[PDB]
Structure formats: C-alpha cells, structure tokens
Design a protein around this ligand. Structure first.
Ligand code: SF4
Ligand code: SF4
Length: 55
C-alpha cells in the first residue's frame, strides 16, 4: 500500500489513473484502499505535490 499524505491538495488527478480504482476522495483528502493497492506508484507519478508514498 501507498498512503496519501496531507500534502494532498485534493486536485483529483490521481483518481482516474489508479489501475485498480483504489483511490477515492476521502473526508479530508484523497485516500487509498490499502486492501486493493498494488504499489504501482502511478498516483504519485501524476501528483504535483508528490503526496502518495509507499508505506
Ligand atoms: S500505488 Fe498504484 S495501485 Fe496504489 S493507489 Fe496509487 S495508483 Fe492505485
Ligand atoms: S494527485 Fe496528489 S494532490 Fe491531487 S488528489 Fe491525488 S494525491 Fe491529492
């Protein structure tokens, strides 16, 4: 699992790019479903603030 850090600016860009649809807008920011994420890094790759990190 990657996890989206609080640097997230809630731009939405990563949501459509996750190959497994593991991202949603959460209550405070975007959030990753750790039961689906496969660590591809694509979300970080489209993130202007580099908020998703491998955890
Ligand atoms: S690392 Fe890959 S699988 Fe995990 S949330 Fe980001 S885009 Fe989706
Ligand atoms: S691309 Fe980055 S800043 Fe935009 S919603 Fe996703 S994690 Fe947040």
């Amino acid at each position: 699992a990657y996890v989206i850090n609080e640097a997230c600016i809630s731009c939405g860009a990563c949501e459509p790019e996750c190959p497994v649809n593991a991202i949603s807008s959460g209550d405070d920011r975007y959030v990753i479903d750790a039961d689906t994420c496969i660590d591809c890094g694509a979300c970080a790759g489209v993130c202007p603030v580099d908020a998703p990190v491998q955890a």
